[PDB]
Ligand binder design. Structure first.
Ligand code: DHT
Length: 242
């Protein structure tokens, strides 16, 4: 099973946020470290994506675009999986050095978005998601958000997305209900990503007022690509009609 060999081989390892756990759990300190984590993870997501089967057949401009649109969903989904494996159902394992308890969820001012992420994390348990299913679903998430006006080569994108969907099907077949369940879970990622897109955008705009630092790559993607999602120029592809 070449496809699963590849997905297991390229899966990124542990990334630390570099958070100073010695300081108080302030809004500014927590969100600055989440931003730093995001910047560090993005480096890993790019290297991961470029090594996926068939990814290099996209036009190079579309390679950059799909990563810049899908990162939030991808990172939230991977975070749910590691939370599921590592911490209890009340906590979120963003990184080994940045674990949110209930107090930090409140102080981050993201309590309601955190509730949704905890629920996503728990679904991995409720649905008994295997590591193989997790890997195939995470790969599909990279191909689940695109411009309404289309990518440079929309045709190659649609064929690649089709091949990832068939891969998920094959992994299940080793049923109809299972495919239904997994596609419903994938769709559930998108409304969570949208709330976080909204939150991070609003925060970048007032970042100097509230003393939150945004690293360079994050500030660029949040001011350039995230507003296209929020204005509806780039939209998630749902399996089921929303
Ligand atoms: C993707 C990250 C960081 C990586 C991860 O584990 C998931 C997590 C989800 C919340 C994001 C965060 C990056 C920084 C963001 C975008 C903040 O600006 C507000 C919400 C944060």
């Amino acid at each position: 099973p070449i496809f699963l060999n590849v997905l297991e081989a390229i899966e990124p390892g542990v990334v630390c946020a570099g958070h100073d756990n010695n300081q108080p759990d302030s809004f500014a300190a927590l969100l600055s470290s989440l931003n730093e984590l995001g910047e560090r993870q993005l480096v890993h997501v790019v290297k991961w994506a470029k090594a996926l089967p068939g990814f290099r057949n996209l036009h190079v401009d579309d390679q950059m675009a799909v990563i810049q649109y899908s990162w939030m969903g991808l990172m939230v989904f991977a975070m749910g999986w590691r939370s599921f494996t590592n911490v209890n159902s009340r906590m979120l394992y963003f990184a080994p050095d940045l674990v949110f308890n209930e107090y930090r969820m409140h102080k981050s001012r993201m309590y309601s978005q955190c509730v949704r992420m905890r629920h996503l994390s728990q679904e991995f348990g409720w649905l008994e998601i295997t590591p193989q299913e997790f890997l195939c679903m995470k790969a599909l998430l990279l191909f689940s958000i695109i411009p309404v006006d289309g990518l440079k080569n929309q045709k190659f994108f649609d064929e690649l997305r089709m091949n990832y969907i068939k891969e998920l099907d094959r992994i299940i077949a080793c049923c109809s209900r299972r495919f239904y369940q997994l596609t419903k879970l994938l769709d559930s990622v998108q409304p969570i990503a949208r709330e976080l897109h909204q939150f991070t955008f609003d925060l970048l705009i007032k970042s100097h007022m509230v003393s939150v630092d945004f690293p360079e790559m994050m500030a660029e993607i949040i001011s350039v690509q995230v507003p296209k999602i929020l204005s509806g120029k780039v939209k998630p592809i749902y399996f089921h009609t929303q």
